[PDB]
Amino acid sequence: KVFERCELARTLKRLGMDGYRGISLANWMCLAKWESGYNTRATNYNAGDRSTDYGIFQINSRYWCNDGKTPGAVNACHLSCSALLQDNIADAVACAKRVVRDPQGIRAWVAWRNRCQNRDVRQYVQGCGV
Known part of the structure; x- marks a missing residue:
């Protein structure tokens, strides 16, 4: 759901994204x-x-998962887009991994190269309390 910044640090670390x-x-x-x-x-x-x-x-x-009746959905992550918004982060992480597993990596979203393009973002997870 709508959690805070420190929760995201342990949330991805619990899945193995750290x-x-x-x-x-x-x-x-x-x-x-x-x-x-x-x-x-x-x-x-x-x-x-x-x-x-x-x-x-x-x-x-259309290029990562299928919500239910989406014909363009290529099913790259091979799961339900609805699960990505659900409390379970396994689908969000499993599908996120597939997005970065490509040659682009973590450059699929423009917001990453607009506010985090090779920037000092270590403070976001450094000092969370894991």
Whole structure:
């Protein structure tokens, strides 16, 4: 749901995202701040695009998961977009991993290279109390 910044640090560390694919949770948490404000239920919609963002990392339902009746959904994460907004973060993390597993990495969302493009984001997870 709508949690705080420190919760996101332990949330990704509990799943194993802390220091995954060469990136650190510090960059992953700084993105969730502007992406959904540390909110898993946060989801964006589309106007005739068949791509609804679902999850704390805003994942569209046309190239990552399928919400239910989305034909464009490629099912990259292979799951339900609705689970990404649910309290369970496993779908948000499992689908987020697939997004960074590509050659782009953590550069899929523009908000990451706008406020965290190779910036000092270590303070986001450093000093949380894990």
